[PDB]
Design a protein around this ligand. Structure first.
Ligand code: NI
Length: 341
């Protein structure tokens, strides 16, 4: 049965609610982005209307084989009427295709659902600038001051630099990058670009990336592993055993592997600066854990909410324990008293 925080009051609408069967009273199911925790339950046999971005829609069709008739893609930054309610999709700065959703209720309430997001000051000049928000359904993944990490751009600089150095010292080094969902594609695209190579990957992943509307994508990726000196592999294979085994497969073209695992936050962020990150090494194999986040840092979260000044905040992550819930309510109150709303 569907929890309260996935329902939109005074509408026939749910948000990311595909794993509870037929939700009593739902006329339209909204999917903010194509990550499995959020689409859990969708398949080719689902037969209600699904509202989403163009990108998300592409993945539903080709990856989950949802039929075309039940897919309703909407343009961003554009006012749209759905079951007689005005809605707007906004870019979430999460993974490809990820949206925030604005609902203009018939009673005059306005609700912002963030989906999964990474708060940015750029959002303070979207269509959010123009009016008030009563209720905010918030992505509270990192809602605690200990959660700090660099910008995406800093991380990318470290990675491009680390790869360019290693391969220029040893032209027979291979570079491997781990993946398990959509998101974080800049990591391996940036690395491939600096090395003048296409990114080589399984057929399943090539298919996934072909649904993302990235410009010039045919120029940047390939299933032909032999023609590539940057390879993608499943995240579970990014360890000494998995990499040794992959190097074998490459038929003596390479005598070294440098690999990256994009993580989210990890506790080495509580001490170490991005600059000072070092890898784990065993023999001819090095592995770097790099803190490339597609969710708000505590400070970025704090900024967006204090800017938006919502009347009520409903968290959508870390809702499972009383200690988590109480920690988040206290921060909300601090933020409100500091800002004056
Ligand atoms: Ni997500």
């Amino acid at each position: 049965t569907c929890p309260f925080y996935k329902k939109i009051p005074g509408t026939g609408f749910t948000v990311d609610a595909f794993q509870y069967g037929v939700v009593e009273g739902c006329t339209a199911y909204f999917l903010t982005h194509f990550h499995s925790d959020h689409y859990a339950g969708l398949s080719k046999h689902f037969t209600f209307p699904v509202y989403c971005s163009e990108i998300t829609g592409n993945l539903l069709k080709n990856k989950l084989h949802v039929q075309e008739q039940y897919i309703h893609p909407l343009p961003l930054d554009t006012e749209c009427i759905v079951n007689g309610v005005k809605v707007v999709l906004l870019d979430a700065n999460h993974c490809p295709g990820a949206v925030m959703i604005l609902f203009y209720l018939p009673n005059g309430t306005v609700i912002l659902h963030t989906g999964d997001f990474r708060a940015d000051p750029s959002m303070e000049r979207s269509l959010l600038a123009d009016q008030k928000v009563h209720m905010l359904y918030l992505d509270t993944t990192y809602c605690s001051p200990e959660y700090t990490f660099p910008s995406q751009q800093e991380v990318i600089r470290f990675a491009i630099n680390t790869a360019f150095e290693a391969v220029t010292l040893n032209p027979h080094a291979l570079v491997v990058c781990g993946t398990y969902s959509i998101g974080k594609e800049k990591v391996f695209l940036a690395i491939a670009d600096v090395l003048g190579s296409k990114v080589g990957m399984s057929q399943e992943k090539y298919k996934t990336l072909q649904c993302l509307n990235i410009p010039e994508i045919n120029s940047l990726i390939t299933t032909d592993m032999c023609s590539s000196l940057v390879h993608l592999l499943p995240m579970m294979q990014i360890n000494f055993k998995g990499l040794q085994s992959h190097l074998k497969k490459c038929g003596g073209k390479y005598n070294q592997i440098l690999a990256f695992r994009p993580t989210g936050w990890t506790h080495s962020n509580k001490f170490t600066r991005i600059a000072d990150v070092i890898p784990q090494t065993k023999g001819n194999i090095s592995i770097y854990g790099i803190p490339y986040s597609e969710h708000s840092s505590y400070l970025e979260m704090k900024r967006f909410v204090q800017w938006l000044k919502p009347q009520k905040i409903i968290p959508t992550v870390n809702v499972g324990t009383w200690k988590s819930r109480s920690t988040m309510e206290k921060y909300f109150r601090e933020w409100k008293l500091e800002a004056g709303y």
